[PDB]
Each structure stands twice: as structure tokens, then as C-alpha cells.
Amino acid sequence: VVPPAGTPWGTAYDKAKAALAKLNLQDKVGIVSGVGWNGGPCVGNTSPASKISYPSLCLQDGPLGVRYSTGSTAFTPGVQAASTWDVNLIRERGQFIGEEVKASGIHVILGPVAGPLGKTPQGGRNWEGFGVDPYLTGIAMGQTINGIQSVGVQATAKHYILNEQELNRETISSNPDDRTLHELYTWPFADAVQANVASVMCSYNKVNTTWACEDQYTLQTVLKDQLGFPGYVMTDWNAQHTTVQSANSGLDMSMPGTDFNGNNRLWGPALTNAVNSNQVPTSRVDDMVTRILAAWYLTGQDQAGYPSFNISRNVQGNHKTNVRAIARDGIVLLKNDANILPLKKPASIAVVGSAAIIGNHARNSPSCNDKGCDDGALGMGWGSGAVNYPYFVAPYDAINTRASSQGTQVTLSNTDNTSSGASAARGKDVAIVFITADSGEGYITVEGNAGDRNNLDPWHNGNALVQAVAGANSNVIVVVHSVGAIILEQILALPQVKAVVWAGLPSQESGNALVDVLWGDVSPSGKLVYTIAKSPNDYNTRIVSGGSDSFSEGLFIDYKHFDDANITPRYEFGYGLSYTKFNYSRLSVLSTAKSGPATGAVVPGGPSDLFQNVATVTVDIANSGQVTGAEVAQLYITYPSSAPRTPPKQLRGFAKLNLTPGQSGTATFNIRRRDLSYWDTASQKWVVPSGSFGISVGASSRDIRLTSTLSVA
Ligand SMILES: *[C@@H]1O[C@H](CO)[C@@H](O)[C@H](O)[C@H]1NC(C)=O
Q1: 316-581 carries CATH number 3.10.20.740
Q2: Disulfide connectivity (predicted)?
């Protein structure tokens, strides 16, 4: 409805209303209408309103840093940040991004990403988000937006909603049932809203046959009325289709204003015309401006002294510490047989694979615009969510420096030639093989991949490369840099493969991060944020070629499908090895949670009680092994069986504890009312069912160490 007084949004609204009263229609139309594709200096720009000292609003990509900048940090993709399971690193990433954005004189950063959530492993842009889980992605969304906006920068929660594949993204209709729409996909956007996100970007796709940027139900009823979003909705780039319907459905901002060619200017003069011809009421436009100006006042951008736009400025500072930390702590150790890792003092190391060295990807090459290539070391996927590297630390260069410092001889085979890799690996103590898979936004086809991936195999003949190295060496370590799940069964069937390092997407700090882990300066502590199956056929969704995706799987995506269908994955959601072991004890559940619908008045996030704590689950974690390591403890909740069909397990908590040998620590999971709720379609309300909730705590979604119950009368 409207934000409550005495809150940041409430005060922003008071300011916004006073500013609105000083404006005429042209002022207002200029505020809501982008100047045109490449019409201003930024990715998006609106028209200034000097009467209220409102600048031309400057909007820039993206979720991992400042796009087109030559003096900015390339932060890790969101998927790597979520792979840390570290709320502190996640918030810091947001803060550091915020700092660079403001320092570059940009008002709005186009991120973080809650949509796509990532139901299909082949999804081209899943890596921009925070994994497959709505709870984790939601927590990550909230932490990142707190971080960004604490600096005084506007964040943009995108893409709203159901943009789960790149193929035909501008035409396909996503048609899930109501409960699925709310309880799975909308969930993380509620976290974003509750975090006071300034803006939300509507998606390219249709939702139940209606384009997302024209959908009254999702934009007005769900986002604005049910989630109580007080900010503004912008379109993805040329995702607007009508002048009048888009406006009346709840669209607030036409971005960038035209199509690539300067056509399809649906607002601007056309909006002026639609208001004058009484097709769009002035009240609607007045609401657009209030939301936009409120976001400006909320972030304090009205105050004198905001830096001017300049993406040539070196705004990096020491922010690389975050990239280093996340690239490092987001690595998932998948296999460590015979404890080959960490490496001690081997006489010789073979380094094999084109992905070991600097290539056109790391170099910001003319052959790799928008990072549309997997050439040499990989740090992120491609598209609007990619940025320029200020530098790039290749795995090889970092491995060579560390190994040479201890007398270890390094032999490099820097291509993906199987015979060269064999020659390099022959007679060496260990062989480290580098493989990749890449994907991105659906306007670039890279090596026959239209955005989404064609398959879940390693690129550049990675499987055959590993097989050749295994023919020549007993002690193979496989390092994988990837936008998502790869079927590892061919690699795992080779007895010579002793270690598998799921390194993820490390950006500029690739090599340093890997060495930290490989040599055991730190223990790996990342855990998977998606399921790695034994077969491509174990996944229950595919990239759809037709005009419709019925989302027939409903609530059962990724690990929820694997649990429901009784399928054993190779590596489950929340799985990660360490150089040490941890044990869990002393499970306690404190709860005052009461059943029924949420009852609080709608504020940002929904009814005011939904994000409030109703319960607390606690476990002790001790490092029982030989070395220092951080453990990610996970809480999974099973709803009463009397409640409507729900996945058997749902992530509803996580904690990360660094523990030296013999150290014990407390993991505390705070449970919000919504964490015990399901969406009831008939009443359009979040409801806590009565009964006994299963409480499961452990090291992964399958490695449950302790169980208890939470009882709701
Ligand atoms: C942009 O910033 C760079 C680096 O700080 C500086 O050299 C240049 O003069 C600036 N450009 C403008 C137009 O102020």
C-alpha cells in the first residue's frame, strides 16, 4: 500500500511528495522515460529535473561490478559469493560494489540477481544469481542490497520474473501455478524488497501469456501490493511492448527508452500523448515519479556532493580482498582421495589445459566483448553481467610462483591437446588438469552455445583431456571453472583422478585463490549451491524450445526433485569437503511460532510479521580433525505432512564457523515466520500450518547429522 511513517521508505515518501508538487507533466515524463538506447553516457539515463535538483539518473550494469569501466574491480559472480555461504563476505561484496559505483558517479547499479533462480543447469545466466535455493538466494539478495545501499547507491533486483532460460526469452511464456510463482520464484524478491531495494527490473519473458513489463498481477498485485514494494519498476532493455497497458499495469520506468535502432519509443512523447488523450491517468504517472524520487531520497542522492559520472576513474582501492576471499572461500572441494590435497613438497608438477593460462577472456580482447568467449582462464560468464578485468591472476602463473619457491619443477602444457597433456604429465608426482564450461546472456552464441548450454559436458574436449592425462599419470587433480553443473562421471570413473576441485567462477583472483586452497594455506570451505547429478536425465527440467514452459515441476526444482524422486546425485546441494572433519552436537529448538495466516499490515516484504523471528535453532560444531577449517552448517525443515504438498526438505538456515583443531562453536539459525509458511493460493496469504515440523541439521542436504522437531499448535 504505502510505507509506514518513521521508516526509511516513509520519510523518503514525504520528501518525494513535496518534490512532485513542484513538477509539471514534462518534468514527470522526463523522469520516467529513458533518453534512448545509448542516448546518454550511462547504460540507462533519464531526463534531469532542475526544479528539484534531480540529475539525469545514471543507470549502469551490473551484478558483479561497473560495466565499461577501465578502473573498476571485477567482483566474483553472485554464484561464487553464495558458494561461500558467508553472509559477511556477501554483504561486503555489496558494500565494495556500492563504493565503486558511487565513486564512478553512477546512481543505479543493475543488480543483484534473484531471477533466474536457476531451475535448469543449462540456464545461461544462472551464475549471475545465488544458486537454486530461494532461501539462500533471498538471504544473499538482502545482504547484498544492504551492502550496496549502505553506500548510498540504488540497487536493482532483477529479473522479475520467471526468466529461467535464455532461449526465446523475449517471446516464451512462463506459466507456473500460483503457489509456485509465490513460494519459489517470488520468494527472493521479497527478501530484496524487505531489504529496501530501490528498484526492480521486469523481465523479457511472458508470464501466463502477458509480457512481464505489462503484467498487472505480478507488477501491481504481487510486487507492489502483496510485497509492499515502495520503489520503482524499470524494464529490462527494450522489454516494454505498449505505451498504455505497461503504464497502467504498474511499470514506472522505460529503459533505455528505445530499441537498439532508436525505434519503439513507447513513453516520452507517446506517454505525454497517452496522458493528454486520457489513456493513462495522471495519478499513475504521479505514482511512477513518487517511487523514482523516493528511491533517490532513500539513498541520500539528493544531498550535494555526489560524484560526477566517470568510468575512467580508478575506484578499486583494496577491494580485491573481497574478490580474493570469495574466489578462495567459494571453491568446493568435491573429491580428495588419499589426501593428495593439500600439496606438500612434490618434486614436480604438471599443469595442463588452456584454462590454466591467460587468454582472450582474461585480456579484455576485441574477440571477447561482453566476455563472450571461454579462451584461457575463465572468471565469469558472458553478457551484460560481465565486466572488464583490471588484471587477472592465471592459475598457472600463481602455481608456478608457489611451486618454484619450494624447489618444485613445473611443466606446462598450455593447450587442450590430449597428447601434449600426456607428455607434460608423464613421470610427474602430480598432474593438475584445468577444464571449464561457460554460458551467458542469449544475444551471444559462443562455440555453438546460444547463451544457455547445449550440454553438461566440459568444453574444449575436457573429458578426453582428463582421460589422456590419467593414461600418463597416477595422481591427477582436476580443477574445474564453471558457470554451473557438469556431469563428472567420466572423470570420476578414472582411478587416477584423486582430487576434484570445483573452483567455480573466481574473476580476477583466480590463481591466488586456488593456490591458497591447493597448498592448504586455507582449508576449502565452499559448498555447492546446485546439484551435480550422475546423469543429465536426472534433472527434471530442460531448456524449452516451444512458446510455453508450463513449469509443471512446480516447487520441486534441483535438490527438491532429487529428494522427492529418490535420486542419488553425485554431489548434492550443500555438499563440500574440507581438509578436516567436524561434528555436530546439542541440537536445541526454541519456538513461540503460532499457526495460521500472517496477520501484520503489509510493509516492504509483505505482512509485517513475515520477516520477524518466531524460532531459534542451535547446534554446536567442533573441529575434530587435524587442521584448521571452516564449516558450513545447514538447517533443513520438513513441513507437517498434513500441509499441502511441499518438498521433503527446504533450506531455512545456514551458518559458517572457522574452527581450529579442538575448537567448538555455536551455529545459530534464526527462523522467521515465513520460514515456516507456505503460500495459500485461495486466500493469497502466507500460512503456517499446525503440526510437527521436521528439523534437520547437517553438513549438506543429504549429510544430516542431527534431527529434532518444531511443534506448532
Ligand atoms: C575521468 O577520470 C579520469 C581518471 O581519474 C581523469 O583522468 C579524467 O580527467 C576524468 N574525465 C573527466 C571528463 O573529468
Answers
A1: no
A2: 42-58, 202-213, 368-373
